[PDB]
Known about the structure:
Elements: E1 7-8, E2 15-16, H1 19-27
Antiparallel strand pairs: 1-2
This protein binds zinc ion (ZN).
Zinc ion binds at residues 9, 11-12, 14, 25, 29.
Amino acid sequence: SRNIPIHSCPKCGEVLPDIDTLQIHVMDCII
Length: 31
Ligand SMILES: [Zn+2]
């Protein structure tokens, strides 16, 4: 029983399917 967690950017609220996509986003997101 393992769900499918999803990463979300708190700076804006972009839906990030994974950490890899989340990392690239936060790296190029408005600080
Ligand atoms: Zn963001």
